[PDB]
Structures are given as C-alpha cells and as structure tokens.
C-alpha cells in the first residue's frame, strides 16, 4: 500500500549561496520542493526518509553562469493507489451524487449508482446523510472502499470507489 | 518534475499503458526486483499502516535532532496532538496532505508498539509471499478466508484456506488495544 | 535565454539520432488540417482562415493565437502540419536508393534475392557497417533476375533445397527523369517474336511491395526496424513547415508578402486537389497520371529544384525557386553561412593606424565606438560606488553607461526613460556599461589564417576614428595601412574575458608554435633606427642622452 | 559583424570554449526550444502559465526538456522535417562508448 | 614508408620557398592521410567518406546528401566533435571544455 | 556499462594544472565573485573580480575539483588543492 | 580542407591523439609530447667532429697521468687518481655516449648537428656561471659520484607520460630518448668541470631547472592540434608568391592532397 523508494532530484542553485552551509540550504530547498508532490507515475510523495547521510554528490558548475547541478539521492515514504485496491478511510463531504472518502492525503469518490440499491438519500438531515436497514452513513461513518479507476491531477490523485460487492460497506 | 531513478532507454514506441488491477501488475516503477542508490538489486519494500506511521515518526523524531544540531552556534488521542506539534516545528508547513496522512495513518493503526509491529512482518515474510498482498494483510481487520481472498484476489490459489486462517487469527491476537 | 521562466529542467543534446518520417506521426505530430490552398484572408478580411498556414499555428500579426500556447512569435517555436495526398509521391533524394533496394529485392512477393545458401552473400551479411554493406549485396543482386524458389544447399548440388516463392522474372529498372521503367525477359523466343516488355512502376505498386518486405530484411539492408523503413522513402503524408520556416513579411497592411516555400506548398495543394477531384469524379483511365507525375513534380521542387531533369520550375517572373535544398548548400546556406559562421552582436569595423606608443597588447579604440560598445556588468559590494557614478554620467558623457537590468527580465534605457538620473542600483542586478581602459578584447584581421589574427587586447579609449596597434603586431596580423579594415569583438561574461587574457593575449603570443620562432619582430623605421643608433660612429651626449633615458618606464633611475 | 568559418577556426586554435560559445550564443542566435523525451522533435506545445505541455502524438506530460539551441539550428532541424528527415534530440547517451 | 615518403614531398614543398614549419604539423596530417589503412585524400572523396559525426561531415560541400543518407541508414551522431556542439551552441570539448569543473562541500567547509 | 570513475589512486594524468585548466578555474572563480558569490581569501583592498581569483589560486583557497576525461569515458578527479600550479 | 579535415584533432589526457570517433592518430603527439613553441635547435654535440676529437672531449681516464683530470680542476681530483670502484661508473658514461655515436647516426644520416629540441641547455649554464660568479681558475668541489649519479637520477625525472606498466614506460623510454642524448653530450665529465666551471650549488640548480623546464615544454591536454597543424601548413601557402624545373610549389601541394594517379612531373630517383 504504502512505499519506500529510491529517486532523484535536479537542483539549479545560484552562486550568491555557495556559502559554508549550503549543504543546509540544498536539503532546505530538496524538502520544500519534494514534500507534498504528486505525480502519475510516482505519487504523493509524502516524507522524506532517513534526513541526514543524504549523499548530495559532487554537483558539476553550468557553462554561462557560475551556477550549480547537483544530483540527490535520498530515499523517501512513497504513497499511490491502483484500479483494484481495497483501503478504508474517512468520510467527508456527501451530496445527492454520493460521498467522498478521504484515505490519508488522497480523496475518493463514491457514486450512488455503484452502492447497494437498499440505500436512500435523506434529504432534511442534518448533517446529510445516507440511511439503509440499520447502517447509517454520515461524515464519521468508517467506510471500506473498493478502487475501480485512478485519475492523476496537478498535485492530487483521485479515485472512483465502489461497495457493492460484500464484506466492504460498513465497518 | 522530480522522479528520476531506474530510467532505462525507451527508444521512441512505448507503446500500450498497461492497466493495474490487483493483478498485481503495477507501474514500471513498482516492481518485484528494483535497484537501490548502493547499486545493487533489493525486493520492493512494501509498507503496511501502522509500520508506516513509526517509519515517518522515526523520520521525523530524528529530523529534529539535526534540525536542532545546526541550532547552538501513546493512548491515540494524546499522540494526535503531539504529532501535530511535532509537524509545525519541522515540516514545511504547508505539507497539508501529510497533516491529512498522520491523522489518518494513526487513527487506523492496527498495532502501537515496535515490538507488536516486528513480529507481525516475521510471520508475514516468511510464508514467501508477493509484497502488495503483505501490506494488505497488516492493515486491514480480516477475519475469514472468503473476506480475506476477495478483497485481496491476488492470493487465491497461492496459499489454502486453512493456512491463511491460522495467519489471521494471529494477527487478530497480536491486534493491540485502543 | 528566451525570455519567461521554464517550469521544464533545462539539459544538453548529448545524441542525434537521423530517422525518417513515419506517415502516422506526421498524422499524430500535427494540428493542421491544411487543406485550402488560397494562403488567408477571411473573404478579403484580415486575419487568417482555418485552411493554409495558422489553424492552430504560428502566429502574423503581432497576436497571440497558436494553439492556446499564446507567447507570441517571440518565444513560439515551430510546430508542424500535415497535408494528405491523393497517391503517393517519391522522395526527390532517395530515387537513387528506392531504385537500389528495387534491383536488391524482386517483386511481388518482396524478399531478398540471395540468402545464407549462397557464397558472396555470406561475406557480404559479416560487414558490421551501414551503407558499405548494402553496397553490394547491390552487384550479388544486379546479375541476376529471377526469384528463385529452389537452389543447392551447403552440400553437393544435387539436393536443391526450397526457401520462398513466386519465380516470377525481375525486371532491369533504369531512371527516367522522376518515374521507373522496368524491362521484363521472355518469352523463349516463341512468345511474341523478339523484343522485351516495357511498362511504368508506379508509385503504389513499388510503396506495396516495401511494405511487404520481412523484419530482418529490412536490416539486411542499410535500413533499421523503428527509424527507417524503406517504406517510407516513399511520402504518403507530407510535413508543412510553420511560419517561422516560411516567413510572412507584410509590407504595410493592405498588401502582401509570402516566401518561396508559401507558395509552392499552395502549388503541391492545388495540384493535390485536382488529382483527388478527379478520382472519384469522370477520371479518363490513364490520363489522370499525367497530373501525377505533375504532383511527382511540386513535391520533387520544393525539396530540391536542380537536377538532371532540366525544367527548372520557374515561378512566374524568370526567378527560379529557392527549394530547400538550397537553403542548405555551402556558403550563405544554414549550415556554413549561419551556423559554422555567425553575423554576432558587440562588435566594430574601422580603419587601422600605427601607433609606435601603445604597449603590445593595446588597442586604440575610437571614444564613438566605447561609446556603443558595451560590457555587462553585475552589481557587486566591490563597485556599486564605480557603477552608480557611472550610471549618473549617462550614456552622452563618456565614462557611462547606457542600461540597467534588475532582478527580473526587465530593460531600463538610461538614454530615455522618466527616472534615469535617480535610480538605487541594487545588489545582484545588471549595468550594462561602458568599454572602460584595461577590457580585454577579441581583435581581428580577416582572412584570418592564423591562431594569431584573432588576439586579445588591452583597451585605451582614444580620440579620432580609427582603430590604434602597436606596430610589432603587424606581421602576424597583416595587416598593412592602405586602407585595412579591422574588426572587435566585446566579451559579456567575467568567464570568457579568462579565455582572452590567458590564452589569447598578445603577449602570450609571442613565441609562435607554427615555427617553433617568434612571430613578432621590430620593423621598419624602428628596426632601420636601431642599427644607425648602434654603431661604432654615432654617440650621444648629455641634453639627449636624459631624454632617452626617461622614455623607458623601467628605468631605474640611475644614469 | 561577421564571424565566419575562418573566425571559428582560431578559437578552436586558441581552444577558448566559452568564448567560441559566447559568439554564437548571447550575441547571436539564441532560443529556447522544448522537446519532447520519446520524439527528438520539437513539436511540445509549450503553455507557459498553466505549465500544461503535452505531446500529443506520442501522449506525455511528465516527460519533457528545456534546451538552449541557436535559432539556426532551429531552423535547420524543421527545414530537414519539411523534407521527412527527423533530427532526434535526446538528452542522454544510448550506444555508451 | 608510403607515409614516410609522403611527408618527405609535403617538406620538399614547404621548405624549398624559404620557410620552415616543426615536424609535428606535417607529421599529423600526413598520419591522418594515412593512418585508415589506405590514403584517405583531404577531399570530398576522401576523409568525408570515413565513420565521423553525420552533422559534422554535412558541413563541407556534400551537407544534404550526406543529410538524406545519414537518415536512411539511421546514424546516430555521438557529438563528441567540435562542429556537432558548434551548431548546438554547446560548448565542445576544447581545450577548456575538455572536461567538467565541480565544487566540493567537504572541501568548502575546511576553508569556511 | 556501469563504473568507471578511477579512484583517488591509480592516477595517472600530469598532476600539473594545465593552462587550459587554469585559464578557466580562474573564470569561473571570478564570474561566481562578480555573481555574489563568498570569498575565501581576505582581500587586500582588490575590487577585480578577475584579481580575487588570482589571490584564491595563490593561496589554493579555491573549493574546485576538475573531472578530466579519457577517450574510453572514464574520469580522473583532481581538486586545485592538489595540483601544482607552475607555469 | 585542412582545417576542416583535422578539427577534431586535439591531445587527450593519456597524451594520446585521437578525433571525435576515439580514432589514434598519434600515441604521443609529435612522436615527444612536446609542445612546440617551447623549443629551439640545438646542437648535438655527440654526432659532429672526428673520432679523434670527441675522445678529446669526452674520454675520462682516472687510469693513466696524460688522460686524467687535472687536480686544478676538482678538489678531490688528486686522491681520486687511479681508483678502480669509480672508473667502472665513468666508463658506463662513456660506453653510454659511444652507443649515443651510433643510434644518433643510425637517425641522421646527415650529420646534421643542429636539430629542434625542447629545453635550452646553452643557456640555463650560461647564466649558472654568472649568477654565482665563477672564475675559471679555483677548482670545484663535485665529486664524480655527484655528477655521473646526478645525471642519472635526472632522466629519472623527466617524465612525459605518466606510466604505472611496462608499456607507458617503455614507450616513457622511446618518448624522451632523444633529449636524453643531447643531455648527455652536454652534462658530461669532462664536460662539466672542463668547459663549463660548476659547483655543487651550481650543478644542483642547473638540474632542478633543466627538470622544470622540461615539465614546461611538455604538451598541455586540451591543445586543438588538428587545427594549429592545419593552419601550420595553410597558412606559408598563402605567402607563396612566385634540374629542378619540376612541378614546384602550390599545385604540388595541390597534387599531393588530392592523391591523383597522374602526377604533373614524375620522375624516379636512383643511387
Ligand atoms: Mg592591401
Ligand atoms: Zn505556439
Ligand atoms: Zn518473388
Ligand atoms: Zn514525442
């Protein structure tokens, strides 16, 4: 589910901080670009791992200006989803359409037309909510999400999810 | 524009983007064998909830060691307050997705202590096991084989029914209170 | 370098790989949908119309439009278009080739001609190079005729060994202008009565059988399996290069002005478009092909306009066509005329004049060219003071400067402007000031023949026009006076003056490793002078004796 | 002015990188074209604001390069396209040596 | 002795109008005349003929035929050469070029 | 192909700066100060940022190492610390 | 054509010449590694005069009274004068210079004395005798096993390519042999306290600059060589303003970078 990988970034650095702590300024500016990313093929990346013994290598100076490249290797915590994966989460916002499971930094969609059929939209509650037999569905509700599609965004991955097969719904 | 790592030659085609069910056929990047920055080859590692929590927590802790270094010259919901201390005083701040990932990571933590989560990777890693389905296992409540096989269809037929019921009624065992 | 900031991380071209247009990613590349050949105007209107140059491609008249990119031809690159044709049409350069791989792999069926059965084959297949092998194979294929079903094995030749087919006869194809004609054999003297069989290789015909050509015959060949099928030497789909390629000049706004290559495209279209209309209209059987040898015509121009073919394809005035080809030949033509050789910015051309008084390494330089010439500098702790100054003085005043650039991509014309007399210089902004004495510059006397010729100097800023060296320099340079133009060129960055003034300066120089012998010598009245001075008969006494000993700067002050 | 083939020689000569660079660089052409990291054609549309690349064609956003190249050069790579020859730009070496 | 008696001619024309060049410079291109088993000529049919850099041969007389037959056969241009970098505006490894300068943090410490 | 990259032993490249080497450390020293860059060595009163390089070079302050490369793709690394400025 | 023939051309950092494709041209560039403009002709002393006179200037006989350095000339001459352990090493650096007689001979069968070598030799003892103010009259104080030693020490040092194996060592061998020959006909016995006047500070200075300048006028790794060799040989066509009425000058050369079957004036010389 989650992931411990190993990836790479390229940093331009100017001349002006090629003081005697740049070592600290190229972690500083690794995590302030690095924390919170997302891509499609790698993900949210979430945390960077084992701060410290970050081998920044020997960075090569640019041709024209006296600027810096330089290669870091660093392992980090590596986090994305998959058309088949069953996780559980937290509910959020819930509309006539359905509700939106929030699983850690990622937000999953649920559609009514993908629920059991047994399963009404209430519409004077307060806070909004999804009634059946006994189960009651509101924003606390713990619910276990089946993922059928991944769509990738800017910085964010989204989800449609399903809980009509059993053992899932409810927890 | 971050990634880097493993890039081989794709030259021109590539080609067909191939779907990833719980077939276990994930992204190029994801794979059983992958390289590592020594330079040798290693198994994915395959994170479950609750390991996943002291392995950011850890990462963190010992963040602000050297984070104050360069600076001279428990219970549930008590640990979600002093790690939300612990994120304005050495994450960047606007990392509002990890804020959102340990909320989450440790309210559904299956196990708490380092000695509970060591002896639950030991008795998943020995059956020889596929990464993915190891993760799955130690984060999610099963109880039955049938609840277990269908949610994660990639076992099946790589171990009985049997044997997968013993896995889980000790994990249940070793399944730390709240 | 190109103004706005890249989100994309900047890299160096390391490898160019050489491959051909493959029809499907002409296709898949382009946003054209070319197919109007009347150049623009929306009825008469200004503006351009979704059929020729601009739907969803460079932009004219000074606007944003090209594909929602917006930037505005500044900036905007070329991206490409794609035009359909009714049959396809060979490619001007390869006739040569298409013909070799035609005599190289028989018809019909489309397989190579001798294999690993035959000897001299086998030699042939060893060569690990490119196009010295498929340099025969050529000759072990132009024997030869005849696609054999069955020849003798690695054995005795008795047992004769099957591999493919069709035994059908190859045909002996010479050129003919732009299209083939193959000569057939039979029929033993009882067919008919004596004379061969002459017939037109089409275009279709010979593309149908490139592209039934086996994997590895494709590499048996010099042709590889993703870069370069043989099958696409043959154009089915043809590239339409932007504006930026094909310039529109517009003279006023009520007028005109299109390139060369505008036109001939709208030429290729419009015979394009006749040949497609009469297709599926009333099409005389075989008078159609004498409108495709007329598009085997344009297409064949506008790549290349000079071949033994003779019809020049004049466009009507008496001018020729400047094709594309010639855009690229030597001299003046892309490759030795604006790539190899540059016209270059901060640079100066006058006359040159002796000065027996500037050092070496001087140079004379005109106060009118210090005046334009300029160097940019950075705004550093170590001569704010030097540059504030220098910037009050203004770009009239000589010590001056004439811009400032700030922190972000932005100009300040100190000769215009509303705030040039104030202005705070801030740290890590830009001066573009002033040539000053002591800047290190490239000077040169061309036809530059030598490591010399091209040296670097000492700046001394000097009334009256004319470039100023000293005359020991003249020999290596020459350089004479009748009349003898120099040119200059100024540095722009503190990395490429270190290249001038500890490689190229002039008194690195001296010493020539042409001869292993100084280049430089004293002549002429200096070198006529210091015999008549150094003789037995001649002395000096005291009133000149003084004077003498003070001209030498190093002089130790003892008589 | 001009600073042709014979020019270029000398520097050669005198081995000056930078400088032989700054000739026909900053003082001449220099351009600021992307490319694509499957194709070596410079066909991306570039968005420079909403960061929006792609490559249609060949379909990727991620996979993209920023390149300083003379507009000569520019030029010399689409006019060999308008006559099917496809110059590759690729960022890394493939056959090693 | 081929080579040998080549360098002995281009002297003989040199040094019989009064001028006298090193050893090294005649010794070099009558090497690279001969140097590829045969005598490879300074002309368009010669040197312009051999493996060298597709996008450097182009830019001497042949340019598009050598352009048309360097995509029909795939070559691949390592751009190793001065002309391949010259028309990219790189900067060729030359001289200073010749290699890479880098910064060291270890090193940088130390002298604070 | 992996490595490649000849350790600090086994060198064998002249240990002395070449005029080349020099001529471009020198710049790209200078280029840095004039760009802001810090300076090592105290200065004496010299604003030329051309000048400070030469004092950097003199005292070996300079925090440089060249990467020279060998035909086969291999690479030596030598720091100006190291070699031997004559010339 | 030159100039666009050898652009690639330059000396890599294993002092070896290849283009662009790792082609080798020349393994050391100009067969020495030298580069040129550190150079001037010198004489080799070795090659020129009869065999009568080189003994005469060369020939160090401790054993006889008529052929021994005068006592005037070393100070500890007189007590050398006959010991057998120091004539075996001023034999091995005569033997060594009648092996230079013929390998020089063997190269040029001219006899031409004068020959473009690196390192001015003429020179760095010319100032030697007047920068410590020698006279010609009071004796020295280098023993033999200072001189004879301290010349073989030094073509220990002087090192073109940097070798670790047998081959760049032995190819180490070939690179310096000739600069080696002149150094030995100049730095000899006789030669140092007969000619020339030097003392043990002298000697020491004279070897600690002939090494030095040495390491100087090797080849700097980076030195575009194809095209300074090109616009070498373009560049004295260009001033060329104009039995031996055969096809001379300009076309000639012409001739000769075409590589024509026909040449303009054949002919065959025979001995
Ligand atoms: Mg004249
Ligand atoms: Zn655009
Ligand atoms: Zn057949
Ligand atoms: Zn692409």
Redesign the interface.
Known sequence: MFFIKDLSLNITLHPSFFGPRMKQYLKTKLLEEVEGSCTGKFGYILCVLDYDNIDIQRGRILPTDGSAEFNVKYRAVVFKPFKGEVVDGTVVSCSQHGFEVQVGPMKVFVTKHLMPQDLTFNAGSNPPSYQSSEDVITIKSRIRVKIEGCISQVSSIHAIGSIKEDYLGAI | STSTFQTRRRRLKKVEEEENAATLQLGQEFQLKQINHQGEEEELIALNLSEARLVIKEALVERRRAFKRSQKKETREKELESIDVLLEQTTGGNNKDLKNTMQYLTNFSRFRDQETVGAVIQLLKSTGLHPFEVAQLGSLACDTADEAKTLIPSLNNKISDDELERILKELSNLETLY | VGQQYSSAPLRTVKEVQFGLFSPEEVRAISVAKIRFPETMDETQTRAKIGGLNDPRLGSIDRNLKCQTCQEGMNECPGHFGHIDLAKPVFHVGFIAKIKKVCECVCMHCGKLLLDEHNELMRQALAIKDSKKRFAAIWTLCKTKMVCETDVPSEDDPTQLVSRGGCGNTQPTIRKDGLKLVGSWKKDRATGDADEPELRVLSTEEILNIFKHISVKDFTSLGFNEVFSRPEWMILTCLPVPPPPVRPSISFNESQRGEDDLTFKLADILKANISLETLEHNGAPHHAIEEAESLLQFHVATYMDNDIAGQPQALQKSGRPVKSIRARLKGKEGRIRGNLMGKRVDFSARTVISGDPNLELDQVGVPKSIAKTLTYPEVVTPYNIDRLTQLVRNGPNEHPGAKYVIRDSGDRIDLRYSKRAGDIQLQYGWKVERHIMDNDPVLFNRQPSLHKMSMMAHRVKVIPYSTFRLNLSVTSPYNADFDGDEMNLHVPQSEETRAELSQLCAVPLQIVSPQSNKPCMGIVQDTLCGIRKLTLRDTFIELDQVLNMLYWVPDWDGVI | LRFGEMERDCMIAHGAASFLKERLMEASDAFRVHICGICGLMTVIAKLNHNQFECKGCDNKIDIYQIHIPYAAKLLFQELMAMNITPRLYTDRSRDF | AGRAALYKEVYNVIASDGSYVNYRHMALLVDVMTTQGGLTSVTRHGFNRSNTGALMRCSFEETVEILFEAGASAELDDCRGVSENVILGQMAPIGTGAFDVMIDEESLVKYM | ??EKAIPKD?R?????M???????????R?????????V?VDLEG?????RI?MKELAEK?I???????????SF??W?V?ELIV?? | RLVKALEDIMVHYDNTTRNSLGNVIQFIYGEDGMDAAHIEKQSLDTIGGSDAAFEKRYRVDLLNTDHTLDPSLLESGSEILGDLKLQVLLDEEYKQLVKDRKFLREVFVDGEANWPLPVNIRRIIQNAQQTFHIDHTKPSDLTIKDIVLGVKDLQENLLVLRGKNEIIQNAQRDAVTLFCCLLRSRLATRRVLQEYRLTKQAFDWVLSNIEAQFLRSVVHPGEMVGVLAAQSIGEPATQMTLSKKVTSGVPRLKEILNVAKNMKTPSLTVY
């Open positions: 192909l992996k086994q064998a490249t002249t240990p002395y070449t005029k080349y080497e020099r001529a471009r450390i020198l710049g790209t200078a280029l840095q100060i004039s760009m802001n860059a810090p090592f010299e604003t030329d940022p051309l390089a302050k925090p440089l190492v060249i990467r020279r490369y060998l035909p086969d793709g030596e690394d720091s610390e004559d010339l």
